[PDB]
Symmetry: D3
Subunit: 146 residues, 6 copies
């Protein structure tokens, strides 16, 4: 039984993130999105990820606390997956202390420039980033600025 954890703060989840979720889900038996404890509270973040991933039956969303590698090993998962040198440092640290591996996958070109932080700053100053975020995020983003 193969499994990958996709960790992050997801504040908010982006289409870049969902693309990674989709590709992990295609390769591993199970995917767990670990929301690691900002603009949106934990509950909102979870909802937004769930609402954006209904098309991924083998994906589960879960709040995480502490070391990501503890999360991975506790839930019997087998790997961390994340989208793309700082990560390099963490991946090797994570292999050192817990034997957990990290698989990196390149961003789809069209999402190469979107980040949660940049989306937030642009949204707050009146820019349209709705093409870079899931509709569940867009919906909540509109409501929080209105």
């Amino acid at each position: 039984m193969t499994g990958a954890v996709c960790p992050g703060s997801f504040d908010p989840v982006t289409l870049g993130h969902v693309d990674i979720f989709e590709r992990a889900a295609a390769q591993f038996d199970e995917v767990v999105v670990a929301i690691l404890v900002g603009m949106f509270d934990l509950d909102e973040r979870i909802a937004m990820v769930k609402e954006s991933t209904t098309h991924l039956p083998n994906l589960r969303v879960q709040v995480g606390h502490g070391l990501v590698v503890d999360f991975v090993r506790s839930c019997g998962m087998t790997a961390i997956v994340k989208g793309l040198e700082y990560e390099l440092q963490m991946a090797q640290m994570n292999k050192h202390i817990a034997g957990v591996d990290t698989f990196f996958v390149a961003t789809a070109p069209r999402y190469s420039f979107v980040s949660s932080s940049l989306a937030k700053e642009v949204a707050m100053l009146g820019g349209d980033v709705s093409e870079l975020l899931p509709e569940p995020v867009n919906r909540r983003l509109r409501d929080r600025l209105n």
Copy 2:
């Protein structure tokens, strides 16, 4: 049925490569090492990979020709795996033309500086790189310089 292809020229295979093979084998149901058509001939390269991977029951070694993505899709595998911006270019090109994904994994620190080319040049000028290569490679390396 999940599966990863580990492509390369493997001239010769290094311990860095074997580490990647090992980690792919731990996460995917099947691994195919694709030796893509130099110092060693094709037969030698195959042998060296096979001799170095006997401890990986779900790994298979195979010569490859043409686009790696054709190789992946023909053998029903689901992903390319390789050890680590040029790769970025290829991974996105490979996703564009064939929908094949590429998962990157960081080198173990102790193998961070070993490459087939550098090992060859150092070996040929009398340096000891045997700690960076599988014994089946070391054996053949000694014999080819003697």
Copy 3:
């Protein structure tokens, strides 16, 4: 009528910045330096830029607020110019939301290591950075530490 905006916090403006201003001014009909809202207050920053750019007749200095791309398009300018991957992210975000282009130009070698932040920290601890800053900045820098 061609035009470039050179945005930044300019706290303070450096000779690296002025070099970029000079090269933009040489290529575009009009240049607007946008001081985006620290050590010096807004008024000081403006003055320092103006005092350092009197030799550039087609350059104008202006305080900016909000998205830089709003500033560009509102003033009918046609491009952002700045001196040199984070910028890459912003440039593509800025092209996405407003269609505004960003042209990057390499620092003159002699100013490759000067930044506003580094100049400030070195100046405050007693180091001589006057060769890296315009005399109007040097003048005000001396007075603020004395």
Copy 4:
């Protein structure tokens, strides 16, 4: 009268290149594409660029020989423009010897992974890169492999 030269071997011209041509043409009075003296011969390269740039009235295509900065200054142009550290080295060398400036612009995300060399290798091995190249190039590419 402002002007930019877009230099390259353009063997063949890509949609990434055309995007750069388009953005240069939008900012400078005149653009000269300098084809610097491979798969396609000079004549083919010119044709392909011309056929792909008919929608750019202020763009001119011209074969170049020798230093790009000689080309720039001889034709009274004022700047080099190209799409994006090696370039950094050349830009500073070009500023040193001829006072010519280089403005860099980020690739559109969708063309971030396309290069002439990679397109050629993928095309020759049977991959479909027609979405990354102008139809005039696609046409000639089909005919040269058929």
Copy 5:
């Protein structure tokens, strides 16, 4: 009389740091570790460095204040040494204002991923980083979390 200063906050000193100290000590007549004014207080930091460097007779530990280049020149030392673009900026700034040179040395592979900050965060959340830190640091680390 040759001499190198190894500057840093050393909060705490790591085995990566000690490796650099060792290599500097092997090449220069004298080494001064400059602890530049966090988890451990100044006294603890000093102790930890001293306890970890008893095997280096020509190494001295000293608190530093102000510009590192003032420290270098005041103590008649001749160079800064540190383990490895931000450093590039500082090294050139330091050469500009004080004529002090900086020699960089590559991390040993096995310590490539260890940093004071990352070690602290991992230690605090229950991870075992004792293989990456000197025993004098490990001892104090255990006691501060217990």
Copy 6:
């Protein structure tokens, strides 16, 4: 007795190289420039380095053959010094096989863009790079193109 080897092909030696030689000479008791076996023949290369380094009494020029680390250890020197990730690979390989350390030093800003290859190509096509090369090189460069 401390000592550094500065290895390279020096075809030709540049002012960037001489700057590194100067800084090594200032920190180590002895410096050996190792010319590792192109435009200029071995004899010319030696001459050019010698003619450009007469002001460095503790510097010696010598042809090298084989592994640089063999050269270092044979001549009882203690370190490799060179001006600045490929180097990273080699430095760690060189530490692995021979225990030889490599100290990197940043280029002076004004020589950041000069390389032997780029100087040659620019010189051959009629560009003036004499400000980037020692007069002994300039002299020979003029004569070889005339």
